[PDB]
Design a protein around this ligand. Structure first.
Ligand SMILES: [Zn+2]
Ligand SMILES: [Zn+2]
Ligand SMILES: [Zn+2]
Ligand SMILES: [Zn+2]
Ligand SMILES: [Zn+2]
Ligand SMILES: [Zn+2]
Ligand SMILES: [Zn+2]
Ligand SMILES: [Zn+2]
Lengths: 85, 96, 82, 440
């Protein structure tokens, strides 16, 4: 091994063992649970509650909310519709 | 017959990804950067550069943050992740 | 052309710059938002004497604290809630 | 501050506006629902150079192309094809390649999941007021009540709890619907007071009123979390459920955020019988601190093997008088891990003393050496500190909290004051609140 060695190609060995548009991921995404960036799922299922809530990088934006002009309640984005109706 | 080096660089990255090893490398790296205070240093450095330049323009601000953010990575993290990446590359490629 | 060193370093730099760009996008858009939303914005005050709160004010004395002298308010509740 | 005029132009057309928002929501949905590999290969790969992560990769708003930052390939796309907007695939943020900036300051794009209701959301709700946006606000001591308010500050700056309260899930399900009677309702008034508009002491008073119907901040933490659980249970539909939550698995906010479990291993050395071994829920962990100096030392000490001295002990199975050996280990980790440093030594003579040892704690805490059986890095971020000032008898509690954007605040009764990471780290911590940040 040598860091300075010019790379010929991919090992045939390895090829023998393996093998458009971003909008076309939608089918798959529809059938795929919520994914995290840096929280491995097998580690989650192993070391954390089966029903744990997880907010990844929780301090990397404020909680997005708006305040009802009628009663002043701070409402999360996904609760606003309901709180109007 | 010469092979297209650019495309080859793309296959290599792709094989890294299909093994799962790109995730490992990337996860190792972030855990190290988090633990050594680097992510926070970058966030501070960014705030300091917005204030100094009285600007929130992403392109302008990055222009002065990134080089410094690059130098701030400890040599330990750098060395360690580079070795990990080298060892995985030796599983994938042929050299000459 | 390409070697183990050049490609390794390519990959690391790809990861670092991606990460840096991402952290920078979050900061700057947060700031762009806060300064747009609030034209009038003050940052939070910082006393190095460790003596002024976030609006550059001192702590009110609890004699002057009123709702009922605030510091006696749980005492007033014991009674008044009966 | 300017808003991008390119996107303003596009928004003058009613179809186009609608198209941009569907595309923004779908992009963001795709980014939340793609296993890492598919994400690397289909949203983090440049269509021009085919490298993965060549800086940020941007998913075009008007076509399926993804283009990188580092080689200006999305930029070329915008110039060559006329498509000047792309979404950053690491973070869902929209970039204008004419402004050379993110469009960050347009509430509709930020709140694009509500596009279809936007006129109503506009006219009936407002953005936070500058003063309430981080819920910062002090609570006045009302007769020795810093043991409650300290914990309350940490609770209303906890991301899990704020999301829960502002999602209205308790408000929608509560059978008491009184903040004089229901603690969870009282907590909602607090959040309401601090983050919207309902001084700013009413939720706290109501809380104290809930307490009239029936010292240590640690005790109150357990008291208040238990009462959130009870409220959940009180709201359940039938007796199967009440029983289930109480006895098997509870899906309340407290039990899906703060609870882990410990393996208490107890093993006889001669013959290994371990039938006194148990697995126990915890809502926090209590750590000894005598003669130690670093939080990791207290955790080693919590996790180390010790010999149980037990007068005239003989192991039921094998008859050995050798001390049985105990070891605590984390079996399950919670999303928010709360640690108590045991500072109040209640002694044999009835006389408590307070331990003042300074214990160094990290901003990032790795729990991997404390989990039971090669365990991967499991990293939490410090977001909360409660400290005890003064004597066992006469003393006072302060909270320190970290909010979005990493800025830290000290809460000393009515006084709220700004403070740096560096100075918070010098505190004599009693409680520490850590939130799960990375699992490898
Ligand atoms: Zn309302
Ligand atoms: Zn009264
Ligand atoms: Zn490219
Ligand atoms: Zn396009
Ligand atoms: Zn623009
Ligand atoms: Zn209630
Ligand atoms: Zn529960
Ligand atoms: Zn035995």
């Amino acid at each position: 091994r040598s860091g300075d060695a010019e790379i010929k190609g991919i090992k045939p060995k390895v090829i023998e063992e393996y093998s458009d548009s971003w909008k076309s991921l939608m089918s798959s995404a529809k059938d795929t649970p919520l994914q995290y960036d840096h929280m491995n799922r097998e580690s989650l299922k192993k070391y954390f509650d089966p029903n744990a809530q997880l907010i990844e990088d929780p301090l990397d934006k404020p909680i997005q909310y708006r305040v009802c002009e009628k009663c002043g309640k701070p409402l999360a984005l996904t609760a606003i519709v309901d709180h109007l109706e | 017959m010469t092979m297209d080096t650019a495309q080859l660089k793309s296959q290599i990255q792709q094989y890294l990804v299909e093994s799962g090893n790109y995730e490992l490398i990337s996860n190792e790296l972030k855990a190290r950067l988090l633990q050594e205070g680097w992510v926070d240093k970058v966030k501070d450095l960014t705030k300091s550069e917005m204030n100094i330049n009285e600007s929130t323009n992403f392109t302008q601000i990055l222009s002065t943050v990134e080089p410094k953010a690059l130098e701030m990575v400890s040599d330990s993290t750098r060395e360690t992740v580079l070795k990990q990446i080298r060892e995985f590359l030796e599983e994938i490629v042929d050299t000459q | 052309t390409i070697t183990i060193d050049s490609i390794s370093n390519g990959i690391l730099n790809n990861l670092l710059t991606t990460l840096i760009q991402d952290i920078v996008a979050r900061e700057t858009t947060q700031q762009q938002l806060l300064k747009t939303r609030y034209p009038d914005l003050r940052s939070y005050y910082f006393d190095p004497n460790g003596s002024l709160d976030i609006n550059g004010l001192q702590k009110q004395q609890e004699s002057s604290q009123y709702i009922v002298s605030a510091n006696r308010l749980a005492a007033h509740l014991q009674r008044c809630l009966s | 501050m300017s808003i991008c005029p390119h996107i303003q132009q596009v928004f003058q057309n009613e179809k186009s506006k609608d198209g941009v928002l569907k595309t923004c929501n779908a992009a963001r949905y795709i980014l939340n629902h793609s296993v890492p590999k598919e994400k690397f290969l289909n949203t983090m790969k440049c269509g021009t150079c085919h490298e993965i992560n060549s800086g940020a990769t941007f998913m075009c708003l008007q076509c399926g192309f993804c283009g990188c930052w580092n080689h200006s390939h999305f930029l070329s796309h915008s110039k060559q094809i006329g498509h000047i907007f792309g979404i950053n695939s690491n973070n869902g943020l929209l970039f204008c390649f004419k402004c050379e900036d993110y469009i960050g300051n347009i509430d509709l794009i930020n709140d694009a999941i509500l596009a279809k209701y936007w006129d109503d959301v506009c006219t009936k709700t407002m953005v936070p007021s500058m003063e309430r946006r981080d819920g910062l606000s002090g609570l006045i001591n009302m007769g020795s009540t810093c043991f409650m308010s300290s914990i309350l500050q940490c609770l209303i700056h906890n991301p899990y709890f704020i999301r829960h309260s502002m999602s209205q899930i308790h408000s929608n399900n509560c059978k008491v619907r009184s903040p004089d009677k229901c603690f969870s309702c009282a907590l909602d008034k607090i959040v309401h007071e601090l983050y919207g508009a309902l001084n700013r002491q009413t939720g706290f008073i109501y809380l104290l009123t809930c307490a009239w119907k029936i010292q240590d901040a640690h005790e109150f933490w357990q008291f208040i979390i238990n009462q959130i659980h009870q409220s959940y249970v009180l709201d359940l539909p039938n007796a199967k459920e009440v029983s289930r939550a109480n006895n098997k698995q509870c899906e309340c906010i407290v039990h899906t955020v703060f609870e882990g479990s410990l393996e208490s291993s107890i093993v006889c050395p001669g013959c290994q019988n371990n039938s006194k071994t148990t697995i126990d829920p915890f809502l926090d962990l209590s750590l000894d601190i005598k003669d130690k100096k670093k939080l990791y030392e207290c955790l080693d000490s919590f996790h180390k093997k010790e010999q149980l001295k037990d007068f005239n002990y003989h192991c039921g199975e094998c008859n050995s008088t050798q001390d049985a050996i105990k070891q605590l280990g984390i079996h399950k980790l919670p999303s928010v891990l709360v640690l108590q440093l045991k500072r109040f030594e209640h002694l044999l003579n009835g006389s408590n003393r307070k331990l003042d040892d300074f214990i160094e704690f990290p901003t990032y805490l790795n729990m991997k050496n404390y989990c039971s059986t090669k365990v991967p890095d499991i990293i939490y971020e410090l977001i909360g500190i409660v400290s005890h000032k003064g004597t066992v008898n006469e003393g006072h509690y302060i909270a320190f909290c970290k909010i979005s954007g990493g800025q830290w605040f000290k809460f000393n009764d009515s006084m709220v004051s700004s403070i740096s990471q560096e100075e918070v780290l010098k505190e004599q911590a009693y409680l520490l609140f850590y939130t799960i940040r990375q699992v490898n």
